[PDB]
Amino acid sequence: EVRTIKVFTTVDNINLHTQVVDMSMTYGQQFGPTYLDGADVTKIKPHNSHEGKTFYVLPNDDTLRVEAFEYYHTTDPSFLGRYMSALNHTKKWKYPQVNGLTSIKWADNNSYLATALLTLQQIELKFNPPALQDAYYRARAGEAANFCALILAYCNKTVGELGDVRETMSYLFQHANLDSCKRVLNVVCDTCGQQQTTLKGVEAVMYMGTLSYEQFKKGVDIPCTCGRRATKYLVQQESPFVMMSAPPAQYELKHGTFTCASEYTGNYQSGHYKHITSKETLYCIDGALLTKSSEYKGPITDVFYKENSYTTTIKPVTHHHHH
Ligand SMILES: [Cl-]
Ligand SMILES: [Cl-]
């Protein structure tokens, strides 16, 4: 005798697909890789209690391939498996409210994700994939498991794997609407003259080499191809924030001069991230932990600043000689 139950399959947890499954065959024999709220049930046969429940599957048919792309903006074949695998862990993490923001209690080497999530709640950023829009809204309300699992999937990081905050933000920004962001730079060499460049989108809001926005406006020394040290400085900026990054180094964060920052203690193989936010005082959020101070000095790697529109008032030759 053939026994069956009705279940629903999905790739986006919105659009459902009715299935009649044979209770003598595993989900994998019938759907391929199958997950129940992150749990891998591929090798499990249907239970009575599964009737009417929704299972994630991989995009096997054309219908599912379109739904998955429209929701996630990826066609990487393993994406849904990686998201589900991560979700099985992140649904067990805790997301405490710390100083009015959703943080993450430490687990599974997740300090880089905690400071990324805290940072997002302090900068103006809109995501493009519906999956991130929906999950980020939930994360702001305090239910951040799906958002964290999506970050891991989009960044191709597994739970427990070491992550870099700058790289994680770069991926998040790649999936955000930054088309209104513009940056104009000028590079001045005594030998080679002046070279202006215009950057757009993610490249307009990220810079690697100095933590100081003020120093970037004054001028930073970089190598020129001729071998001399040229001066690079910010000509014009149109964006709601900027992110300045550098290899970790002792750095003083002054209250009221920045939005938030990330601190990395450790080395290239093992470390830990903390988050610093400048509000009525300086708050240091370390997952679930919170401390305060009037001054802060530590190995800072990333600093975020507010912006709207900036235009330099100084001529190039003045930046080259006075930075
Ligand atoms: Cl959004
Ligand atoms: Cl996108």
Ligand code: NA
């Ligand atoms: Na935000």
Ligand code: NA
């Ligand atoms: Na919130």
Ligand code: NA
């Ligand atoms: Na974009």
Ligand SMILES: [Zn+2]
């Ligand atoms: Zn030169």
